């Protein structure tokens, strides 16, 4: 058994997820070993994406653990994400099926719209013109969403959701004439320096789960993240709470999310840290400790994704 939350479509999501993105200088081979160690440690939820360029390795890890009798397919919750070069409705299903081929899995447990700005179709994930300009595309995300719906009805994705959506863009889906399925989640950056209270409340009001990425303060990969931003895990309050509990600042940051109702992701490719992170279910924070952490909020977004700023759907 393991801790899950009931989604708005009746499926269940494990509340701690294993993140699989690593910077390009880390070999892809490392994704295979890390996902096997995450499964061994007790992770039951594995988050990836077409754009992570690791679905071969992550799928092999999952298939290996199923084939050797370690885990059943029903006890793995695997998320993929539709990249922005495939927002056009007729391209949605092919992108899912391409991911499933790479993974050699029959279905994903969750498919997200990765990011609300569209880019021109093609193999290139950030297509550029000869002058280095990103080739943006104009697509009705409500059409993209109907396509997602169809993937769910086809059994290819057990649940569907969104990522990097703001209030306006969520409302656009929720108010769509003819909506069949609400997004089960909105996967967004969330940690004690950017705690997303407002958006979290809104998602709650709609029974949408907020899933937190960069919950440990991100990879800090240049050029995605400003190296001058504060290092989350060096925070003196998180570090004092860690000392107090004989845990670590990471565990405090993970636990904070769980207690506020957020499903939380954590990436590590390090065996010791992978095993450490599951210890989030071994302790609890008091109401005063939670308030202390709430007080750390500083409107610091690590991942602005500002190379996609300009188009109307840019969400920040
Ligand atoms: N939807 C989106 O747009 C989007 C965006 C960003 C991320 N994501 C997803 O969310 C996942 C996690 O976010 P993220 O990659 O930004 O990273 P993160 O989980 O915030 O942090 C990863 C970093 O923390 C380190 N770490 C992990 N456990 C630790 C611990 N116990 N003590 C100290 N350091 C620890 C990792 O190093 P080691 O590997 O060396 O332990 C890595 O440097 C990604 O992998 C991806 O699945 C989604
Ligand atoms: C290398 C590469 C190419 C295209 C997209 C991404 N990453 C993202 C872009 C926008 C939104 C989210 C991500 C992500 O890493 O999840 C990366 C890392
Ligand atoms: Na990561």
Give me the catalytic one of 52, 78, 193, 256: 52
Annotated active-site residue 52? The verdict is yes
CA–CA dist 116, 59 (Å, integer): 26
Cβ burial 233-246 (10 Å sphere, 16+ → b, else e): bebeebeebbeebe
Pocket probe for ligand 2: among 22, 48, 51, the residue whose CB has the most ligand atoms within 8 Å is: 51
- Spell out the domain ranges in the chain: 1-316
Q: What topology does CATH give the domain 1-316?
A: TIM Barrel (3.20.20)
Q: Which position has the token pair 């390009």? A: 24
Residues 6+ apart with CB under 8 A from 177: none
**Experimental approach taken:** X-ray
Q: How far is the CA of 239 from the centre of ligand 3 (A)?
A: 22
Which protein residue's CA is at the shortest distance from atom 5 of ligand 2?
A: 51
Q: Which atom of ligand 1 is nearest to the CA of 115?
A: 3
Q: Which of 239, 238, 219 has the alpha carbon at shortest distance from 229?
A: 219
Q: What residues sit around ligand 3, an ion, with C-beta below 5 angstroms?
A: 19, 21, 267
Q: Which residues are annotated as a binding site?
A: 17-21, 47, 114, 163-164, 187, 213-219, 224, 267-277
Q: How far is the CA of 236 from the centre of ligand 1 (A)?
A: 20
């Amino acid at each position: 058994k393991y801790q899950c939350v009931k989604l708005n479509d009746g499926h269940f999501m494990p509340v701690l997820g294993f993140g699989t993105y690593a910077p390009a200088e880390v070999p892809k081979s490392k994704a295979l070993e890390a996902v096997k160690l995450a499964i061994e440690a007790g992770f039951h939820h594995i988050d990836s994406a077409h754009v992570y360029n690791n679905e071969e390795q992550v799928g092999l890890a999952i298939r290996s653990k199923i084939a050797d009798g370690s885990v059943k397919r029903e006890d793995i919750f695997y998320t993929s994400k539709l990249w922005s070069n495939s927002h056009r409705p007729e391209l949605v299903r092919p992108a899912l099926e391409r991911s499933l081929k790479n993974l050699q899995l029959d279905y994903v447990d969750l498919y997200l719209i990765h990011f609300p700005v569209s880019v021109k179709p093609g193999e290139e994930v950030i297509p550029k013109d000869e002058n280095g300009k990103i080739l943006f595309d104009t697509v009705d995300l409500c059409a993209t969403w109907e396509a997602m719906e169809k993937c769910k009805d086809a059994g290819l994705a057990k649940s569907i959701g969104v990522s990097n959506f703001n209030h306006r863009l969520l409302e656009m889906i929720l108010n769509k004439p003819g909506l069949k399925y609400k997004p089960v989640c909105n996967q967004v950056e969330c940690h004690p320096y950017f705690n997303q209270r407002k958006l979290l409340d809104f998602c709650k009001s709609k029974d949408i789960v907020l899933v937190a990425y960069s919950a440990l303060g991100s990879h800090r990969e240049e050029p995605w993240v400003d190296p001058n931003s504060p290092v989350l895990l060096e925070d003196p309050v998180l570090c004092a709470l860690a000392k107090k509990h004989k845990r670590t600042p990471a565990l405090i940051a993970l636990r904070y999310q769980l207690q506020r109702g957020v499903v939380v992701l954590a990436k590590s490719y390090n065996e010791q840290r992978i095993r450490q992170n599951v210890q989030v279910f071994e302790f609890q924070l008091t109401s005063e400790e939670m308030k202390a952490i709430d007080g750390l909020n500083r409107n610091v977004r690590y991942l602005t994704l500002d190379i996609f700023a300009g188009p109307p759907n840019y969400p920040f």
